Every structure is written in C-alpha cells, then in structure tokens.
Design a protein around this ligand. Structure first.
Ligand SMILES: *[C@H]1O[C@H](OP(=O)(O)OCCc2ccccc2)[C@@H](O)[C@@H]1F
Length: 252
C-alpha cells in the first residue's frame, strides 16, 4: 500500500472528464472536426491503454483512436518545435493559419496530460505511471506521442518549420521526439524545405546559432533525406511575438 508501482507521475486527476471536455471544446472551436463523436473518441482513447500492462503499449493499440481523430490540416502550414512548447503555441494562437501538433484534435486532447492503466484491471492508475527512462519506454503516454508525431510528420508537406530552443545545451537533440521520430518521417516526395527558427534567450544575441554543431548535424540529416534546410535566428522572441501580433509595427 505504501509502495508505488512506477517512478513517473500518475494519471492527471479527472482525466476521463478532461479528455471528454477538451474534445467538446475542440469540436466547438473547430467546426471542420464537428463530425467527431466525442464519447467514441474517449472510448477508443481508453481502449488503447486500459487493462494493458503500461510497458507493453504499441502504436497498434492507438490505431482506433488515430482513425477517429483523422484530420487533414493544411500540410504546408505546419510548425514543429523541440522543447520550446510555450512560444510555439503562443505563435499559433496569433498566426492561426499554422498548426503545431497540439492544434490538432488528438494533440489538443493529450497536451500536458499523463495517463496509464493497470495490467488486467479496468482501473486508471492515479498514483504513478511509468517514467520513460527509469521504467519503460512503451508506456501509454510515450507511445501515444510517438504514434501521433509520426503521422503528423508524415502528413507534412512543402515548407515545414521547426522552432528550437537556442538556450539549451543541445539545440537539436537527435534524441528528442523531433529528432528521433519527426525528422526521419519528413518525406522528401512531400517536403521541399525544413526551415529552423532558433529562439535565443534574453540578451544573448551575439551568436549565429544556426552555426551550432547540433544545427549542422540537423542540416546534414535533412540534406541526406534530399530536403533543403534553412535556418533563421530569432534574437528577440519577445519582440517576435509582438510583430506576429501587430505586423504594422515599424521595428520588425
Ligand atoms: C513532436 O515532438 C516534438 O517534441 P520534442 O520537444 O522534440 O521532444 C520531447 C522532449 C524530449 C527531449 C529529449 C529526449 C526525449 C524527449 C514536438 O514538435 C511535436 F509535438
């Protein structure tokens, strides 16, 4: 009773109700997805992990959810991001013609949430869920993001943009979900260019972070997929967001 099963956070409280409400809200904000039956979405979501050992989840478990959440977003208007979620989302809230994963129904449902079941019972584990590193990688949360990120990267076309956190030790971390799943799923038949926006932090604007070794590593991988690579520095993300909000400002 004093022992917890896993190292990671348990299921977010009221996960069932939260997923259902987010579905209702999404279908309300976005009419093109209004055909979705939100109860059915939850059912299939639930079906992916309930009663399953939380170290034995597969992409196949999530397929019925993937089917119900079928959504075509303009393939040429996609924004990827690695480890800089906030600004990317803040960007798409203003620049409403562009989409991150979390601006899709499926991403929107799962964003910031944790969930897992218990092997061979109907219960949701509200106490602890597997940590990707300490416990096992094939857990309900990690496998969900892997599945959706693959499809999202596979649907991408034309010019794909990626926002990266220039203030990190590894600006392109080839171990991230961007690096390990998204990048290698950018199809050169569809995707002409990958353009990176490297977001600087604070008054650190003296360097061209597009010259960072990890960015050259990204350039190399992208080029070996027969995809053009472009990189821009964003020295002032504070002013960047403002210019996105009010493009009429003479300062940008
Ligand atoms: C698909 O995945 C992207 O997220 P990410 O920040 O690149 O990866 C998650 C963080 C991480 C970092 C190091 C090692 C493992 C995981 C998003 O653009 C999109 F939602």
């Amino acid at each position: 009773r004093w022992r917890q099963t896993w190292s990671g956070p348990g299921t977010t409280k009221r996960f069932p109700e939260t997923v259902l409400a987010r579905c209702v809200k999404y279908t309300e904000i976005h009419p093109e997805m209004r055909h979705v039956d939100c109860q059915s979405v939850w059912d299939a979501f639930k079906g992916a992990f309930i009663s399953k050992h939380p170290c034995d989840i597969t992409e196949e478990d999530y397929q019925p959810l993937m089917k119900l959440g079928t959504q075509t977003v303009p393939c040429n208007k996609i924004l990827l991001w690695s480890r800089i979620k906030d600004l990317a989302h803040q960007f798409t809230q203003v620049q409403r013609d562009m989409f991150t994963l979390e601006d899709t129904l499926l991403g929107y449902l799962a964003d910031d949430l944790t969930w897992c079941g218990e092997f061979d019972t109907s219960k949701i584990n509200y106490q602890s869920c597997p940590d990707w590193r300490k416990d096992c990688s094939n857990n309900p949360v990690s496998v969900f993001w892997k599945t959706v990120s693959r499809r999202f990267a596979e649907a991408a076309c034309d010019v794909v943009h990626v926002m990266l956190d220039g203030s990190r030790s590894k600006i392109f971390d080839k171990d991230s979900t961007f690096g390990s799943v998204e990048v290698h799923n950018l199809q050169p038949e569809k995707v002409q260019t990958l353009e990176a926006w490297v977001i600087h932090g604070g008054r650190e604007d003296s360097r061209d972070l597009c010259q960072d070794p990890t960015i050259k590593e990204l350039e190399s991988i992208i080029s070996k997929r027969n995809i053009q690579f472009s990189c821009k520095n964003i020295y002032r993300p504070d002013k960047f967001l403002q210019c996105v909000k009010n493009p009429e400002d003479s300062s940008c």
